[model samples]
Target: QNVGTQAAEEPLNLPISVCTAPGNCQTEADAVVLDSNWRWAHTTTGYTNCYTGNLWDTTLCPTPETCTTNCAIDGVPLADWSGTYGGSVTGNKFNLKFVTVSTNIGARTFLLDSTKTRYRMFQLLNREFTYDVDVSSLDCGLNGALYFVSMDADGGAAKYPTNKGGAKYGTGYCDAQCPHDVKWINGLANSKDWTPIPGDANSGKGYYGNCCAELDIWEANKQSQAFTTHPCTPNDQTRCEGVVCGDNDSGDRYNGMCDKDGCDFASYRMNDHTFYGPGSTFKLDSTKPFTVVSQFITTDGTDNGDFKEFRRFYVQNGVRIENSKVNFPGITAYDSITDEMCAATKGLFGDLDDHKNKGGMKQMGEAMRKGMALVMSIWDDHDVNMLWLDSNYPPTGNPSTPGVARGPCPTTSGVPSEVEVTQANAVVSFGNIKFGPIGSTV
Candidate 1:
């Protein structure tokens, strides 16, 4: 009459292949830097009355932990940051207070506590109104359907915050004995609840992610293989073919988006310095140095252009017809830039390695290390990035000694011709045009 199985407490030694060469897998613009409080609200109020702010004035409400601001309490109903619940306001008790109130928000906060306990609130309504949170996937639906999106850090241009009447806090479930259906991209009859309709739509007013994020992340981006399903939503007219959504009204802002017109080139190698080797490709004299590597988001357009067509196989290797044949070789010979560089082939070189083959440059260095891990897994699935060109050496967690000494080591070229010109200017700006069978210029 026992339960014998004998071994149950010895499993986490960890490292199966957590490999820490720790020098350069760093890019995501080196990691997650975005925010400016455009939208972030989460509300689920119930039995609310923290009184003492003395404002709700319930016969001079002085209940729970009295006075921090004033004193008043009510029947519990006050939701504005867009959870919508202005229903039962006899106006007396009050204890709800969430401050971040705004700053283009990121560390996000708002969790007042009480309705017995678990009501849920994770707002960040911009960059496509986000909040999937099935409560850690336990499948939390008793009453949950809230979203908003439209963000602007300051430089301007980035909008998606709609539900405006204000005051909502339901989530108590039992909207008629367990009824649930608001799902969006399709599932369980494609669910439907928080109704707001009229520009934002979720009914009575609430919920919107429109052109992107009304929760359906494309079958979870092919079940998490990630690549964000190529600019898909926003009325996906076949991946909006060619891409657009870029304009920032041209005054040239920073945190507000848009600047892809051209020639921002500070580093395509050269003075951003470090040259000769890794099959050497180099070309950046300028034809507006070309960097808006990808774009094309459509919702029948409100206005923001560019994706007339995109695939950019490094603009078909003639590097803009050798920068327009080194500045107009007596009337540009190739015209239409070689049919826009042979339709910019994007097969990343059909399974790589065919550079005319000698020893096939080690299958083109293992196809440029699996094509820079598939262009850093599609620039980390679409947040896209730039600005890394920084090495004066010093990386070397040892790819047989990769770096770390830019200053002392040159007993006649033993390394340090300024550390090989800072490893030839750490070559970024999208690794200097990496179209491949496998690239190498890091």
Candidate 2:
């Protein structure tokens, strides 16, 4: 369930020390690395726990006589969430922890505006959660500093992948190798060619799959951003469809969307065979807080206008593993792949809460599992809306006391605040962002 405590200060003054490891030991390698600006920033690689195993400022251990059964616990693991250690204490010491994340280098490109940290935060804040940070000082670094973390809260582990030199210097499943798939939403063959028939998307194929389903879709600068693999010729109605078939080194045999060359990383076609794949039954459960898959639409809706609006999706059962504890469990908290999916899910869910009917934890989790419910929003512009939501989405729900406050849950009598609605509307209308969730229903 969503946990709440008394309203605290701006920086969140907890009795915990931000450390590389569980404890706040200073000499340890996992200690939090402070940038030149003194702000703690760690790369996905080249770092781990530095000091105390439990946030202890020193290596000395406390005897039962001094203190026992307190926040300081070595092997017992004081704070465990989703399987990984959240924070802990030892003796009189306290500690906070963070892990390094990685990103794909090929995904790197000079951002249109050098003010990328803002853009990055905008993309990350697209999730359905709220956090307090010094927004003005928060800057997006370089071109590839931010990459897509699928189905996670604020790009979670997806943001940790670090890029070292000209190449990406980090380790993870989605690292140097970024292979993905493509979905044929309009029921076309891998090499089939056809024109947009106005109602082509009305078919089950178009509704369920397609839109470069699993492949990479990107354009570095404003100039290249307009390019799409789909044919946009004037009167070639037979071949005027913007839907791409596939592409090879020669470039877009059907529509110039070569898996490898089409995207910087490798692409995976929709895995209809597996439970987690499209059309399959495996999906994250809505009742529970689980991860969800996310994707990118390389092209805009000009080719297929109806594909523009955003919506939610719900699947069933698969969100949780048997005997999975509430805090954190297998692969959910630590696995890199799991990190990616959850990152995307978090961003989509956060945006959805702003516009559509929101469900409870159980309902949302169940929808995720059944692939029956996912959320989406239509933005006016791609960049700014991502920034707005990245800064504020699901900003503090209603009070917990009965009759005291209301939240986004439809069953609840209370409704979302006007401030939130206005901000969300602005982002959706102006950002041109199409926010929605993806998955199948059981």
Candidate 3:
């Protein structure tokens, strides 16, 4: 919450479009801010680090109040973008590198409003969101994500005075996963019960988790991709403690406020492995760029209505492609993500019904109606090696089992340490962002 006086956070300019009709869209002056987690939080008066590797400075951060008063968050200048964090902008495209010379790994960024003081929140129910992606440099172990989270526009600055950093510093961040790795929660330091994750040099777990709804527009690599809706109870950026945090590390995944296991629509998992891949034989070749379009359909076809289903289409070389029809055993040949699809998916996977247990698509729509900040990230998973997304997971049984193999990736793929070395130059480009009513952004 303590934004550093060392330098001011000057976000990178990135324009986006808003459409009301087909081929009719207007550009809005948006910008991008790095997540506060990557910033250096140090003592306010001197250059002493208040938080190092996996622990806070004992003297300055003995208590949350003391840390809030003593620590300040540093900013990233333009040069630091590609040199330090491996981020760059050319025209409207934003490219994020997986690894950089400064030892900075992956990064997460949020879109700022035209004013540059708050987040550009979206109410995307009954609307569509569009973006073009270039995953040519991405590999099997990396994830390039463009999603939305239910965070406050001001990053809790209005509610918590200590949060001087606010959205300008990319302060508030929450998802259905209720991430506990966030250093600050509810505008306060979360250092009391910290435990460093093994092999990871930079992060640790805290007692509290920031929990909220998430609309995963895209979580992809060159091999496969998924779009999911994750719902949570008491949504809107609620902070949870201990058990309610859905601490997967402690075996309480299902007994929490949010649906940790979201209802997902993955092309490969739908038994259409040829729907997306790196080669010319695939519907959308990952070796080149393509436009990804997602539509949120409402029952009444109005902005204030309830969601009925979600639809997806891709534009590759000017040819529009419909979503692949599901050909899984004993399931309907549906293409879009509907309530029925979610039910079938959960049942087929023998997964916990967390989506329905937490409120399903109905809750997801409600959260989106309230507001959600646009987020783009690139990271390699530390847990399960992202097997759930692109390989046989549960990491448990045979690959030939239905609902087991999500992609062509091997069960041992996506090991963070291994991928970090093998795919250090991997990059993901996201550009041409646009959103509006259904059928307007194609």
Clash number for candidate 2: 111
lDDT of each: 0.17, 0.18, 0.88
Q: Candidate 1 vs candidate 3: which has greater TM-score?
A: 3
Candidate 3 global CA lDDT score: 0.88
RMSD of each: 24.9, 24.8, 1.1
Tens-place lDDT per residue, model 2, 210-295, is 22111112211100110011111110111112334322222433332212111111011111112221122433221222222232
Candidate 2 — what's its lDDT? 0.18
The runs of at least 3 residues in candidate 3 whose Cα sits more than 4 Å from the true structure, single-residue gaps closed, are none
Give the runs in model 1 whose Cα sits over 4 Å from its true position.
Answer: 1-162, 165-344, 351-442
Which predicted model would earn the best lDDT?
3
lDDT of 1 by residue, 1-442 (tens): 0001221111101000111232222111111111111111111132333211112223322321122122111212123321321111111111111112211111111111122121112121111111111111101001111111111111111121121111111111111001111111100011112333222111121121112111111111100100011111121111000122221233321211111211111111112122111123534211122221221122222122221221111232334312111111232222111212222211111211111111211221221112111100011100011111122222332212212111122212212122222222111111221111111111
Query: Could you give candidate 3's per-residue lDDT for residues 1-442 as a string of tens digits?
Result: 6877786677889999999999999999999999999998988887899888878887887787788888988888877877888888887898899989739889999999999999999998999999999988877778999999999999989988888889999998999899989998888888777778898888888778899999899999999899988989977898898789888878989988998878888989878989999999998899999999999988788988887788999999999989987777788887887878889877877877788887777888998889899999999998778888888876777877767888888888898999999999999999999999888997
What does candidate 1 score on TM?
A: 0.19
Q: Provide the lowest-lDDT 10-residue window in model 2.
A: 222-231
Q: What is the lDDT of residue 153 in candidate 2?
A: 20
